[PDB]
Assembly symmetry: D3
Homo-oligomer: 294 residues x 6
């Protein structure tokens, strides 16, 4: 005869399952390769726990996703050991400002840094923020793909990148789309890119470019993207869903995302284009990550 209400009863059964499997699941944890906490409010305490339990392990973490986690500077510092384990680090939509950039800077300067992909989009970094970040990028050798989409850089921000870029020698992809920047800033950076030793791709769409500004960019092999007309197209939609995840019919949003995943698999299967396959597989990555979060 049951004394515990439904949710309290389930909590209780969880505890027992978790108690009985403690030794087995402890081993499983030390061998994790992926860590998705997108959409959970990472308070100081949760931050502390994640660093304690996962601050060390056998393998690198192929991916660490903390999109939309309401992360602050302090949480960042606490999570440093976990980030040092990461190859891909997603920190989008976390409200990070210049304060947090000092901590990222140190993460990038750290001898143990093995981050190849860093996504900092949809955080109000600021020009001040990026300047600080740039210094970390100056002494880093691991990072090949960096995203700064919609991070409040503006003119000042992009000119700073343009001037400083060549101090990093391994960066391959930089995304600076949607940052309120005008014609000359955009051009200075486009110029720096083409002169860069490693930089293969630069995103400049959704900035405040005039139509003549665009042509100049277009006419200027580091590849400059000035218009949305491919995986990036997708990124920005899925940015919206990630935003509104909590706000929508979960069961519906799940099926939109399942069909889109299926849809992506096949388009990937049925072209032989290397760069097409790579672009789709990227979108597969973002979609799987939203499903998980549901």
């Amino acid at each position: 005869r049951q004394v515990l209400p439904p949710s309290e009863l389930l909590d209780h059964l969880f505890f027992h399952y978790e108690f009985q499997n403690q030794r087995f699941s402890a081993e499983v944890l030390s061998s994790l390769r992926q860590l998705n906490l997108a959409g959970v409010r990472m308070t100081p305490v949760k931050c502390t726990v994640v660093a304690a339990v996962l601050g060390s392990g056998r393998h690198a973490l192929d991916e660490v996703n903390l999109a939309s986690c309401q992360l602050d500077p302090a949480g960042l510092r606490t999570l440093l050991p976990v980030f040092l384990r990461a190859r891909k680090l997603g920190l989008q939509l976390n409200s990070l400002g210049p304060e947090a950039c000092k901590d990222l800077r140190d993460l990038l300067l750290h001898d143990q840094c093995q981050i190849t992909t860093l996504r900092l989009s949809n955080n109000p970094l600021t020009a001040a923020g990026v300047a600080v970040l740039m210094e970390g990028l100056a002494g880093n050798t691991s990072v090949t793909h960096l995203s700064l989409l919609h991070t409040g850089l503006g003119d000042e921000g992009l000119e700073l990148l343009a001037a400083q870029l060549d101090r990093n020698r391994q960066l391959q992809e930089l995304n600076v789309a949607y940052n309120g920047a005008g014609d000359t800033a955009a051009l200075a950076l486009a110029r720096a890119a083409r002169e860069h030793p490693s930089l293969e791709l630069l995103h400049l769409y959704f900035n405040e470019l005039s139509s003549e500004g665009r042509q100049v960019l277009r006419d200027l092999g580091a590849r400059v993207v000035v218009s949305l007309t491919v995986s990036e197209y997708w990124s920005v939609i899925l940015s919206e869903v990630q935003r509104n995840l909590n706000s929508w019919d979960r069961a519906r949003v799940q099926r939109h995302l399942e069909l889109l995943l299926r849809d992506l698999e096949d388009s990937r299967g049925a072209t032989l284009n290397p760069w097409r396959k790579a672009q789709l597989l990227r979108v597969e990555g973002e979609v799987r990550a939203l499903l998980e979060q549901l």
Copy 2:
């Protein structure tokens, strides 16, 4: 001096309580007879845990209530060993469609099935879904009470039951209220019922019957209920509260239910009629199912 916030502090106290009592409550679990998880979102993982901890035990589970649990087909399959333990199985309000009917079908066909009462109301089963369900019912001997209220059947659905019914020989009560069906379907089913070897009671209220349709049914001993206006009266009332529980004022609803519970006790004590009593005992169980769930 306290470092954790209120809910975080309570979690921590829970863990310690649970840790200290582990041996004692592990024993309590193994001799459970009732399982109410109504209103909790039963994700794959919760499904997995419940199957693991409660998949086996001493006694049958006199009742298993998972109304309003956002259960999918997969979670169903996971939960099959728990369902095989159940005498009474509530799965209302779970968004189950035709997909989930195959799993129910197999549950009903399983040699170990000892389910007597199966409530599937407020799930979009469909005519397709009930066709599949019917096949399971064909090879079942345990189920005596089946509820299909508001399951999307329509004319196609009820005509199907009418044609297939006599393939089951132990069914006593069938609720097909509120299913969008018209006069002839309802009449074909009412006909099949009266010729059925076991079927004692069929519910047809809240369908799309014409006033002449209803008299025909009325004039037609399997008893046919065509109008709500006792145990089913309140069933639909409570079914309604069941949708909206956490979704509106808790304390107020708690008191309404306590007073209603009390009104029913007294009503039951003041009748000698074995039938009336039994009808009322049903409703108290439902009130108690909601009280607990609060």
Copy 3:
């Protein structure tokens, strides 16, 4: 080419429709017989407007329904000329306290009062409030049906009615259900009722009666209703829907009510009993009051 947004555009079309039809609908207004404003927040200004436009007219207002209107004492005073036109006056769910009882008192004492049915349920009137109300009732001859369900009366309140009742000579029905009262208060009132020259029906269900308390009442022709378990059955059901109307799924509730309405029609047509019919006619009016309000 459209400049206004959707709702703003609709407002503008409304104005023009209203402007064109001004003379015609002004006439329609002057011969209204019914006034349902249930669910709208009746502020001082809305109160003022309604009094101004409808303070006078040809006919009596067969019914005035202002349930759930967040009405205060002042708005009451404002609305007095409209209330003097009313045969039936619904003021449930308006948060009326003792303050508002003086205004009701005066309404009941007014020479032009022709209110027959006054429903004050779900307002925290209080024993103090009912004392004041009672004085009005003492000098009234129009009111035959009075509802005080869940108005905070308690023992003090019901004892008051018991002592004062016979001062009114035309009252036929009194609902004092769900008022927190105990066995003796309920018994004193039930006693006063049976000795009352006119009082045909007293409701006492959902009070804090003991099971022995209830039998006593039951064993005690003024009819005393001690248990819910027909017209009052649903009253409390609907009273519940009435709280939560816009607050939850509209289309679903619309359909439930349409089907219920329909179930009641048919039930009424299928009984010859003049009493049953009348009970059911009451409930349809209430269903229709909710339908309209949607």
Copy 4:
């Protein structure tokens, strides 16, 4: 005295009363009607039909997405619909009951509708059958959208069998309708054989990966994989962007004006957007 909103209401009345003659003229010369998102009750319906039932111009666009429209409201709104070149009725919970009214709209001698968008309504196969009869006797409609309308197997086979009865249809969207390999194939076949049909959408159905290739390999153009416009059309229906909206046209226009043989496909993908922008 007047609280803020009530005071604003009162100012509106007076502004509206002083400008009555002037704005009455403006209305009769309206060419667009967007009521997307307002709950169109019987009364609101009645008012719209009264005030806008007739006018000088055709209504270049009529948008009533997400208006909680019922069959009755539909009948009331018919004289307004008859004025419409483009008619949006997405997300209105329209079922088979409403399809009779649509049927009669399509069959009406005055029908001037070129684009009809019925997506995200539970039409059903029963509903589309009835709709198809209207389409059979229509000559105005060139673009029809049936995205996520509960058609399934039965529904798409119906279209495949009945389509060639219409001779002016250019674009048919039947994406996201729960349909499998054969139904999708039947309809893809019918499309290629169709005298007018230039584009068929079949993405987000229940196709197998071999189903897809067959479709792909099969000039009516069949779209089987969303992966060149319909991207938000599927998801934009879930919220029902504050900058992103215009920035796709601001982006696709500055890209429409920098290309030959496929300068057209940029335009009708800009138009699927230019829709949702104001829509």
Copy 5:
């Protein structure tokens, strides 16, 4: 596999399992207990009593504001309460039923409670009578808060008649209790005659402007007009500040450390804040 929250739950379990011995020690030496805002069901109550029913230290503060506590929960929590120096129970919907349990808490030989905050509970005059009996046999409580507890006329007169039965009460808050001129005056009188009572709060009652002057003109200090601390105490109960919170102490501390004869009143007004800051 594990979704984000479920994965976090699992990490928590493991962190909690590894640290069990260590944090068990930490708990037994807790001195503060704040559960403000969590719905304390029977089970949660039971757990708290089990794990924290006994310990080394007194609990310098126990805060359970806004916890949806009932009478039963109260009884369950008694052994925890007995450990408390300061006990907050505001906003818990406590009525006369609960007052018996409070009464017994106050009468208990082990009662060490100095500050008891019962505001924004519908105690009632019936409730306060019962509470008063407990207060009669209590010696620990120096600060009692009855702000907005439905006392009225009847309630305050009761206090006035019964007060002198307690001899250690220093501060009584009966603000915002719907009481009129005479009740307020009776109680103000009783206070001035009281052996210990240093401060009585009477603001936000139903006093007339002449009532106020009489009170004003009448050393137990009677506060009749909120216009030197209780400012948010009245409104802070409505939300139940992200910077404003600390900035009042950050402001009142840097003002507590720049003054003599009334350096004390800055402190106990800082303490009414220093409460709500963590509370």
Copy 6:
């Protein structure tokens, strides 16, 4: 017999009342002296209407309150004629940034400007914003009381004021509390104030002052307020209520505010202090304004 649902029926009666009283109320409007639209979303269209109907009239508008109106730069420009009528203008909590400051600048430079009190608090003006505003203040002679509480000024912002202040010769009260500014900025401004020809009162509380910074300020007759320990105390509470108005129990919040108003009246009546009376009367102003808004 009624055809219109409750809210639609009330709309209809409003229209008729408003139609019948058109001539009378038209006259009333032209003689308005006060305009409170606090808390309504002032869209372009509403802005347009308010300027049309109230762009001119007989009297000055003793007060114009548009707190919490979601006003943009464009709405501001549209509302310019109404603002030119105003003696006191409240524009708090409107999200105004540097963009809007050009429009305020022009409002202050306008020959017809008769604004004495301008409240711009809780808008992210910025140092850039204030610089622009300062220029308008340089050519204004009407404004005696200016509030810039929490407008994102910081160090840069306050130093700008300090340097520019003496260009205005009639300013009496400046509020720059809660603007993230440090010791020297605060001191420079305090210094400028004491040297100012007219400035009687300067608020500097809730800035980032060190305790030694405070003493220096304190030790430094223009009156400098460095700590909250009076009407200003209140302002900032009522700032919170105004914020959360829509979010709270309106009936409750109304009674808190009624009792506080009563409370204020009396404390004003029962001290003879001129400056005390003026401070309370200010709080009376803010409270009455919230009540109205309810």
